[PDB]
Symmetry: D2
Subunit: 121 residues, 4 copies
């Protein structure tokens, strides 16, 4: 699990075109200020659409590869859990485009993101 | 320190408009396939331009807040260290815009980013 | 109207937090290849959020200013009209964040876009 | 031709990995307010990295296809010409990543951009 383990990520739900993953906001993933580090949030998002694209393709002859990621940071989180919901926007043969919304415990948007995943042999 | 300590980041060089930060590529920050997780590289970059903006303002009066971040993933990193060089593009009164390039051991671009930092009271 | 005139843009529908704007796909807005220029589509989207943020503020005291825009180009538009649907994501005091989806005649996603608008005196 | 023609773009310089293209700031390309419309500036940049990728490939067999564009608007352009300078960041087999900086007359940064171009058969 690597990073996924380091961040204590858990997959709450998966279906085709949809991934919901969450993680605890701990000292380990805070910025020094400290509220959850924007980078930690983004890493959760990239994990979510990587898992999604992997679930949508044939693992045996293909591999999903993050190509482009972008993010707006909105509210902050200092405790509880944050939850990322990745929903697919486009399911191209070569690329997938995902929409990711990351919320805290108060249902506030913490980060809004889009990711582009290349599908490679 | 928090995430900065979790990822074992260290500043190699700072001067007005420039930050160079690096970190070792360990299992703790890999994706499960065995290469540095794209989100960890992005976290490195967000950190670099947050420090850079903090270095340009009166921090008794203002805080830097990451507003928008984007990133292209280019080559991968399996081991060694990765290094983020953040150079400022625009130092405005209310927003700073940063260019960040991240490279592995063999000087390959792993990630290129742009970061928009809000300056808040 | 300017560019909005040059592009023959027109507002299909408007309400709080929502803007639907369309334009004809003409030779004037085409890339030298056969289809609508990606930059023309993005200009439609940026106009859409600018109008929406304007509709959400006191236009006699503050003014909306595009700050950051990002776009995925998914499908092509060869003819007919394209339509941008901008829905607001976060309505902050100093920044508005918008989701924009642009579609052609055949219900295909042409462009998906996120736009950040500064609110300023 | 087409949008290039509409915007009166002039290719000022080309070499491998570099494209300099300018255009006049006319009412045609203004926002209503109105300075140069952000979208017009972005279309100029997307044009520059499209031409640059075309210059790098066998256009008897391949075409450049804009995949992702992002942009920070910085200063505004009121009149004269604006100039887009596109330099390549990464020239991959199937995708190219470009930096584009767009300036006005008074040497001010109007727009900074990163463009991701797909190389398609």
């Amino acid at each position: 699990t690597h990073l996924l383990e380091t961040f204590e990520m858990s997959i709450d739900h998966q279906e085709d075109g949809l991934v919901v993953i969450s993680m605890p906001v701990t000292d380990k993933v805070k910025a020094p200020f400290g509220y959850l580090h924007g980078g930690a949030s983004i890493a959760l998002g990239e994990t979510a659409c990587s898992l999604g694209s992997a679930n949508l393709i044939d693992t045996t002859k293909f591999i999903p590869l993050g190509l482009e990621m972008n993010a707006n940071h909105i509210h902050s989180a200092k405790d509880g859990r944050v939850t990322a919901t990745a929903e697919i926007i486009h399911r191209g043969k070569s690329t997938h485009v995902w929409d990711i919304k990351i919320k805290n415990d108060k249902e506030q948007l913490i980060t809004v993101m889009r990711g582009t995943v290349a599908i490679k042999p």
